[PDB]
């Protein structure tokens, strides 16, 4: 008879790691909401929050969720043992992630262009810390995909590489989820 | 797997057998709610204690009542859920005649 | 149950040579590329005790300065930096690393695995923790010295306005590098227990120590990244022009809430594993199984669950927190600790206690932590905390709890597992000398500080007047503090001598009655920890292995008024 | 992995209940010696702590409904059940020390805030991480 | 508590070093502390006894000499006793929490009807006291005295915004000081003089704390109470007002800072001098009538020590203090 | 049909699967060189060539 189905150890490891990172973002959320609670007394929040550009935010949100969809198509390709489908979909995900990074970068450049920076207000500090840490996470995720591509280019595609691709997909999905939370907090619940 | 086998005169440690209660989610969730229930006891004690020195005069009845309500719902929930989680163990004890 | 046929001319495997026989260069490159959990755990332990001595020297300098009124040899700035760095290194570079070192060595042996789940991640955790330690200590090379704002780093005092100088920054990074090192250690311990357990070792046949490590792993993963986020926020406020921790934004109480939400689970993270170590030591030397096993597990999980709601009892004098709620919760967290105490004295009840060194250390820990927690309950009530908060009473309380739970019990663990970690046994006489020196010096140092705390001396005071009225008590504290400093000389000499010329260990369990699974294997274990796995069938694999004739008793006398279930009929067929 | 998947449900429900209790409490109780009003620090922490434990518990349960009756969880398993390959484990690697040093360089860089130290630290860090992840798959020397 | 401690040497031992206290709620806190210590001693001895029993009674050599054999009874579970021993601490901490709530609530309640309210400012590193309002009984004018300085406080309110415009923190300037109360009758603490606040006996008194700089704390050990002083206390959601029902006996009492504020945290002492109620009217009329006069001159006008007798200022030289005479001679 | 790397182990999906995000046939991590292999192997099958060499005296 065939062997037992045992838990995927690397999947448990990465899931535990993402559950840990959720509490990393808890701190930034708490700082932002304390800032908002203070600001709503003076109404200054209602002024600074009018500097933002919500349709551009929606566009980059659409780009990032598209990245998630492409990533999971790559995962299906991986579990089938098809290396070339994995390469295809992961390169597309890399492209979309880079476009999201450029989206946030252009957002920042325009914002400092028309009078919002870290020194301008408490809103500036809260907005930029909360979005910039997530931007660093997105950059790290794109780097992780490129490292996966290095791996499956150099090594033969065994289950050890398939689970690596599966594991990086978890991290990217966590990145998409925390972006959705951040967007709903900053552009909608504001 | 799929069934145990013990000879007469052999007593194992009972935990994590398929009939065990520790292996099921209702029991642990009941433990959580049972721990939660004591918060209501604390709340009602806070209400009456603040009353004892003439404070919280405008809301102490509401705090006492809501504390008791939360305590009773949480503790009855925990007890019922724990008993539900232990039902397989009772059925097993009926079946076999061995407690461990 | 199967019984195998005999093997022709069987011989037991060659058990490994003891330590001290290593050749030249046999550990340098092995250390640099290590991914063995057990060698890595040993070096964890050694590095943590190095930081222990380093921090305690600063502590002795503090005491020497407070021996008499007037600033004899320190300034105000140097005194401030001293207590800040003493607190930081002793909590973050000694305590948490020693916890993870003992976890890394012992847990795979207890759960019957060859190696940890993620070896290279474990090595990364070790090295990044040491990197954070050196970064934290680099502040002293600054002309202006290291950080000076207490180990809590309250704001606005930590603002760029109110704390210039790069030492204040180096603290932030040294702590952060330490924090992720801790997290990298925790990722393993969960995944290991979830995925590499031995055959027949169900979850409720694990030793209590690894249960505590499991709960501590989840707790630490909750709370270390929150510290990292808060610390990066403070550095963001400092280097850039950030305003999040500005007082006009409410930054002071924001920082206090966030930091103490991190910080109280840190003390429980230090607390639970050493409770587990004594929960392993006490059954062995009383020759009695652990009393109320699953009850202790529920108590440990209750401590883990309650640690997350207790956090704001460190702020009763801030005038911001809600007093009744947090006072009630920090009363509730006393219950399972008392359950653990009751279980310890219960398993000692009518036992056959032999008083080898680790048992001495364990009973000393119990005696110290009893009064420490008894003091902590007094600190838990707000109306007493209005006077007690941030005084020397607080100092004595948390030194009782930390010095009991960490120092006494870590020494107990070192003496307990020195055979399994080295293949040699420590000197008994030096151990007793070390214990009595530490015990009398400790109680002399810290019992009298309750009185100066009550009389009105605040914490963190660098100088005080002759007319204040608490100079004699400080003098009595200082002499016994120097005795505490002298106490570690026999410990260092004993470890050094026993490592290289100690008594060799022949049997697998020199203490005789080891219950846990690590006492069934060799001393030291082989590279992959197990030349053969016993038939695991209870919470005492090694005991039931070495004493088969006891098993019929061990299963029968377990429960008061035990049922007739031994006479029940046969239940199945093979 | 049955018992540990399900024992996580106690801490998470307790934390969630404490979060809701605390939010109502601080938003309503106008006690002297304190100021009325919801505090977001602490409440956010409690809800996302419940989130962490719930993520762990739900993933473990979602996985455990797939796996078989593993011998480590079988209360009367024999040592012969687990005979075979346990898995692959790294024998040795210099890269954990290297990337610890890289993180140290980056941390020192943000201490003094010399921008070149930050850039070189990040570059060195991703280099060391890549060398870690490609260790057991570097191609054989091409003649 | 309403019930007094045992008293005698037992009370002194149970005290165990607390000041007696000089307010009603100080007495309440002391009584609660004494009885809590009684219960704590009961627990401490009744478990140290069991550990001593293990040391002397449950030894292995005794049982082996007695012939008990190589092993004990091997008992593991006694579930009813375990549940009883679990229920006991539950009830203990519960009944303790009841009295905790009682004493805490009678301490913290802000309904004591002050006759005097003093605004207090903490700064790095000294104290500045200012009489904010005084009831007509003690005030010079017969009607209630109000001490807020119009011009100096107008400057504080004007500091909120527009120094030609930075306004980063929620629309206000980062250097806002509108939360500080500036009064016309003020005592200013210096490194050359320990400040002394003068208060009457047997009047409900109020303290309104704030901090120019990093967080401080106001601690009077004879009140058996301390409270943190923060910058922008409203922004921190910190309660900046606390009231004492009265002070019950005259005298000079040291008060300290109990929060790590910086380099000179140890040097930040003050004194609280409680004087006869009839003399307080003379003091306030003297300070009001000729404001140029110093605090010491007013204390001389009362007929008591011009300077803080409880604590003298620290020597401010970093080398002279080596021989332990770190005390400045005020006169 | 989809491509499959020949290093992929063979299996029958109708009665199981090879690896998923949740479960695998191993307790630890999978072999980088293929779980289907059976180490050790012969000296010449290794591809290694041990050098004899001497140095001047
Ligand atoms: C950073 C290091 C980078 C690499 C540097 C390097 O290559 O150094 C090589 C050089 C020696 O290399 P080697 O010749 O291969 O060493 C093998 C020995 O010759 C022969 O082997 P060995 O068994 O002697 O191993 C060395 C060492 C054993 O190895 C280590 O100590 C390694 C420590 C690594 C972590 C760093 C600590 C600082 O043992 C001893 O030196 C004797 C006993 C030492 C203990 C006494 C001091 C205790 C202080 C703390 C208090 C006790 C706490 C409880 C401990 C309980 C343990 C069961 O220096 C070191 O290894 C220093 C470390
Ligand atoms: C954003 C910041 C974090 C960036 C890293 C994100 C980590 C999670 C990514 C997803 C994941 O789990 O990938 C594993 C996945 C599977 O590797 P595998 O070798 O098949 O895993 C099984 C091992 O053989 C099992 O054997 P092993 O135990 O020998 O190998 C363990 C191995 C793989 O471990 C795992 O797969 C499970 C554990 C996940 C990592 C947990 C530790 C994370 C770092 C410390 C805690 C967080 C601090 C923040 O551990 C690592 O790769 C360690 C990564 C160290 C990251 C250091 C970040 C320093 C920040 C300084 C501030 O990784 C890959 O194959 C792709 C590359 C991974 C990410 C590259 C990152 C790019 C550079 C960004 C640096 C920042 C600029
Ligand atoms: C902590 C403080 C000490 C520094 C951190 C530990 C040592 C890091 C470098 C280790 C390099 C290495 O593999 O040496 C193997 C080499 C022994 O040869 P092996 O282990 O048989 O080589 C196996 C692989 O071929 C080895 O892999 P490979 O053939 O691909 O060679 C990789 C090697 C050489 O680099 C390359 O292959 C690429 C060239 C650019 C490298 C740097 C780019 C940036 O990469 C590096 O040297 C990277 C340096 C990373 C420095 C991190 C920051 C500190 O180690 C030594 O001879 C001594 C290592 C240095 C002393 C370490 C202890 C100091 C105390
Ligand atoms: C200024 C202009 C200077 C122009 C003159 C110099 C031109 C050098 C061109 C590069 C070269 O010679 O490459 C081959 C040369 C040696 O290759 P090899 O020995 O023939 O092949 C075996 C591998 O080195 C064995 O190592 P591996 O490849 O397995 O793992 C290391 C990994 C390291 O890869 C990375 O660090 C990149 C990871 C992905 C990041 C994705 C986001 C990037 C934005 O890959 C490489 O080092 C090769 C790619 C280098 C460019 C990456 C950017 O590569 C290196 O020595 C690179 C090591 C240091 C890389 C630092 C980045
Ligand atoms: C390993 C390190 C530590 C442990 C363990 C520890 C245990 C406790 N602590 Fe703590 N502590 C506080 C309360 C407790 C309580 C309730 C416990 C518990 O673990 C105590 C339970 C332990 C026992 C051993 C219980 C007794 C045993 C038995 C068997 C009887 C059951 C109990 C009954 C029956 C109730 C007692 C009955 C009576 C009648 C009183 C509070 C506030 O409630 C503060 C902040 C105060 C302030 O204002 O800053 C504090 C401050 C600190 C700090 C401050 C550091 C800083 O400020 O920079 C540190 C490092 C620290 C460490 C540690 N602490 N603690
Ligand atoms: C795990 C946690 C802790 C341990 C253990 C600990 C041990 C001591 N403590 Fe402490 N500490 C104080 C006194 C002592 C003394 C005398 C010892 C003793 O254990 C120290 C003796 C032990 C030693 C171990 C040192 C002996 C060193 C020798 C004999 C030789 C050195 C030379 C070499 C070459 C070493 C060998 C090196 C090799 C590599 C082999 C005092 C007051 O007397 C304060 C409050 C002061 C104030 O005003 O704020 C204080 C403050 C703190 C704080 C609060 C810091 C803050 O508020 O910011 C914390 C958290 C803390 C934790 C801990 N502390 N301590
Ligand atoms: C790390 C360094 C992050 C960038 C720091 C910086 O320059 O921030 C300001 C930048 C330009 O804006 P501005 O502040 O107007 O110009 C400089 C005035 N001295 O513009 C910005 O602040 C853009 C957004 C930066 C987001 C923060 C990046 C992560 C920081 C983690 C700590
Ligand atoms: C393609 C690549 C870019 C790297 C940084 C450049 C320097 C820089 O930024 O300076 C401005 C920068 C100023 O800061 P910034 O303008 O804020 O970035 O310099 C520094 O901060 C660093 C000062 C470094 C002092 C070095 C002292 C001498 C070291 C000698 C080392 C000799 C090694 C010999 C080895 C022999 C064997 C090989
Ligand atoms: Cu202060
Ligand atoms: Cu202070
Ligand atoms: Ca001195
Ligand atoms: Cu705490
Ligand atoms: Mn305070």
Residue numbers in the entry:
A (entry chain F): 16 to 205
B (entry chain J): 13 to 112
C (entry chain D): 2 to 575
D (entry chain G): 1 to 143
E (entry chain E): 29 to 359
F (entry chain K): 17 to 73
The authors write:
Here, we report the high-resolution cryo-EM structure of the cyt bcc-aa3 supercomplex from Corynebacterium glutamicum, the prototype for such a complex. The dimeric cyt bcc complex is located in the centre and on both sides, a monomeric cyt aa3 oxidase is attached.
In a second structure of the as-isolated supercomplex obtained at an average resolution of 3.1 Å, a co-purified menaquinone molecule was identified close but not fully slid into this catalytic position. The orientation of the ring plane is similar to that of bound stigmatellin but the oxygen atoms are 3.6 Å more distant to the H-bond partners as compared to the respective oxygen atoms of stigmatellin. This menaquinone position likely reflects a product state leaving the active site. Indeed, extraction and spectroscopic quantification of menaquinone from the purified supercomplex revealed a ratio of 4.2:1 for menaquinone per supercomplex monomer, in line with the three resolved menaquinone molecules in the native supercomplex and additional fragmentary map features in the quinone exchange cavity. At the Qi site, the site of menaquinone reduction of cyt bcc complex close to the inner (electronegative) side of the membrane, a co-purified native substrate (MKQi) was resolved in a cavity formed by QcrB helices A, E and D. It is located in 4.6 Å distance to haem bH well suited for rapid electron transfer. The position is stabilised by multiple non-polar interactions and a single H-bond between the side chain of Glu38QcrB and one carbonyl-moiety of MKQi. Moreover, we identified a previously unknown menaquinone binding site, which we call Qc site referring to its central position. The ring of the bound co-purified MKQc is located opposite of the Qo site and in 12.6 Å distance to haem bL. The Qc site is thus well suited to function for transient storage of surplus electrons, keeping haem bL oxidised to aid electron bifurcation and support rapid reduction of semiquinone at the Qi site, in order to limit ROS producing bypass reactions.
